[PDB]
């Protein structure tokens, strides 16, 4: 088992040190520690291999070495472009084993209120005797968000499917939430609402079969 810390944060220009731990007890140079970076919307990329060897295009602010039986990845003067997930992999003579991954977050990106747009069921879907409500949330930072649905003024849990917030190409997050209903259920309420909670503030959007 390869153990990594869950999350680390730093400001731009700050320093961060990633720890990779082996449940067997110790990591040596014969475990060929490999550090893999994953940004959202970018492919995985191997930054460090065999404990300390850097990939040709990685900057030298990244370094890997072994400290006290643990493999370590240090970022000296971290950058906003370093906001990503970092995985550690160890070699045990015949195979690699990956760790759970450590999320590194670089502070400085300002807060962003979520933009919420709720779509009612189409006329084309209602004709096929199906009904789906689509709640689209975009352009919010940070990525923590809470989605609650309301039929009339009462909450709804059955039929709700929500995606995990993922980063767009402009570094802000986005999410979607679906409420599949029957056509009889859709016209039997005066309205339906998607309320989105972000940083203690709640944005509410409402649709109705009226329109």
């Amino acid at each position: 088992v390869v153990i990594q810390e869950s999350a680390l944060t730093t400001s731009p220009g700050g320093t961060v040190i990633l720890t990779c731990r082996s449940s067997t007890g110790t990591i040596t140079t014969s475990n060929y520690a490999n550090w893999v970076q994953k940004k959202p919307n970018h492919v995985f990329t191997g930054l460090i291999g065999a404990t300390s060897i850097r990939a040709p295009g990685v900057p030298v602010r990244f370094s890997g070495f072994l400290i006290g039986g643990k493999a370590a990845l240090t970022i000296t003067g971290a950058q906003t472009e370093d906001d990503a997930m970092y995985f550690c992999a160890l070699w045990y003579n015949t195979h690699y084993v990956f760790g759970g991954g450590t999320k590194v977050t670089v502070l400085g990106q300002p807060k962003a209120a979520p933009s919420v747009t709720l779509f009612p069921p189409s006329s084309e879907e209602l004709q096929a005797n199906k009904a789906t409500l689509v709640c689209l949330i975009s352009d919010f930072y940070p990525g923590a968000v809470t989605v609650a649905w309301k039929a009339d003024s009462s909450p709804v849990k059955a039929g709700v499917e929500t995606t995990t917030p993922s980063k767009q190409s402009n570094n802000k997050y986005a999410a979607s939430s679906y409420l599949s209903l029957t056509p009889e259920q859709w016209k039997s309420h005066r309205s339906y609402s998607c309320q989105v909670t972000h940083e203690g503030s709640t944005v509410e959007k409402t649709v109705a079969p009226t329109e």
Binding site: Y32, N34, V36, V43, F44, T45, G46, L47, I48, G49, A50, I53, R54, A55, P56, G57, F87, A89, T94, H95, Y96, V97, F98, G99, G100, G101, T117, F119, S122, E124, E125, A128, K130, T132, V134, L136, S138, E161, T162, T163, T164, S166, Q168, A174, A175, S176, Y178, S180, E211
Partner: protein
């Protein structure tokens, strides 16, 4: 620039076979070990196999020995993974990977006896506007707007896995209200596993 492109991933019943390939470029392919790495949905990264610079050394993870074979051509820049007697646990995105450099984007491998289901495409009329790609299996689905003319203002969300077992995603555009009456907006949905190619006129 190093580039690895995977292909060959699809849907097969438990017990079937499939062969993955990876086209390498941008570096001397025969001078590096090559790896196959997979990730099942929700689970973590799982190393599968690696191969020597000339094929004289190969290693496999335990859950895979006796069923998979790794090989490399050293005259066409290609890495291969032959997968036999596939099991439900082998469902994952498979990555072509090296110790140093970018991995490939990955190709989805789905081992399931569920049959392929094409999506339904419904217009999300405005009062932003978009389209809804409902109930399909397996992944993925591509979406474009007016034959890929527009690239900004459009956002296609990652798909959600329904309680059913099927997938759904949406893609929305933001346009001026004055553009609604003059300009057209057609979203182009293409689900290759089911041979589903639909263009829907999204309309107020």
């Amino acid at each position: 620039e190093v580039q690895l492109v995977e292909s060959g991933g699809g849907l097969v019943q438990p017990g079937g076979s499939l062969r993955l390939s990876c086209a390498a470029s941008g570096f001397i392919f025969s001078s590096d070990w090559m790896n196959w790495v997979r990730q099942a949905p929700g689970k973590g990264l799982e190393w599968v196999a690696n191969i020597n610079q000339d094929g004289s050394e190969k290693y496999y993870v335990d859950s895979v020995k006796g069923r998979f074979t790794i090989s490399r051509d050293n005259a066409q820049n290609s890495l291969y993974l032959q997968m036999n007697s596939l099991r439900a646990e082998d469902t994952a995105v498979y990555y072509c990977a090296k110790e140093l450099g970018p991995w490939g984007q990955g190709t989805l491998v789905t081992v399931s006896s569920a049959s392929t289901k094409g999506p339904s495409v419904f217009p999300l009329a405005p009062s932003a506007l978009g389209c809804l790609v409902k109930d399909y299996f397996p992944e993925p689905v591509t979406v474009s707007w007016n034959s890929g003319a527009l690239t900004s203002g459009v956002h296609t969300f990652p798909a959600v896995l329904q309680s059913s077992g099927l997938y759904s995603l949406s893609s929305v555009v933001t346009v001026p209200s004055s553009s609604l009456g003059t300009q057209t907006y057609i979203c182009n949905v293409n689900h290759k596993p089911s041979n589903t190619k639909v263009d829907k006129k999204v309309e107020p």
